[PDB]
Structure formats: structure tokens, C-alpha cells
């Protein structure tokens, strides 16, 4: 019972870690596209 509860609690950690990688990838792509946009508009 201890081993099965430890496995479900580790599975939730793996899903939340990949969700934080998901939010970092989409927000850095938005920020990089915005900075290249202000570069072309100032140019």
C-alpha cells in the first residue's frame, strides 16, 4: 500500500514538472517574438 501511494504521488509530480516546462516554453517564445517585433519597428 505504501509503494502504490508513493507511485501515484510521484506521477503527479512528473505531470506538474512538465506543466512548468510547458509554461516556460510558451512564455519565452512570446517574449522573444515581442523583442524581435520592437527591433523591426524601431529599425
Amino acid at each position: 500500500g505504501q509503494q502504490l501511494r508513493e507511485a501515484k504521488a510521484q506521477a503527479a509530480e512528473i505531470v506538474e514538472q512538465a506543466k512548468k516546462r510547458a509554461n516556460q516554453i510558451v512564455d519565452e517564445a512570446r517574449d522573444q517574438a515581442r523583442t524581435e517585433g520592437e527591433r523591426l519597428k524601431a529599425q
Binding site: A33, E36, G37, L40, K41
Partner: protein, 50 residues
């Protein structure tokens, strides 16, 4: 970003051609050279359009 580049550029072209068209109307001094011989022509075409 490319749509905002073209919209900024079009606002500049519209402002430049708006001030050039506002400068060409203000040069009406050629029309200030007129006499009664062209006024008789203008009153003739004002007769023709009733």
C-alpha cells in the same frame, strides 16, 4: 509586427500626401489672375447647367 510596419508606413504616406494636397489648394493665386473675360465664360457655363 509586419502588419503594424505597413500601417505605420501608410499613416506617414497619408499624412504627407494630405499636407501636399492642402498646400496645392492654398496656391489658388492663379485663379486670382482672372478678369471679366473669363467671368463671362463662367456665367455662360452657369447658363448651360441652369
Amino acid at each position: 509586427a509586419q502588419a503594424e510596419i505597413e500601417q505605420e508606413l501608410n499613416s506617414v504616406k497619408d499624412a504627407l500626401r494630405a499636407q501636399v494636397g492642402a498646400l496645392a489648394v492654398t496656391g489658388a493665386e492663379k485663379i486670382l489672375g482672372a478678369s471679366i473675360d473669363a467671368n463671362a465664360h463662367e456665367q455662360l457655363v452657369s447658363k448651360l447647367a441652369a
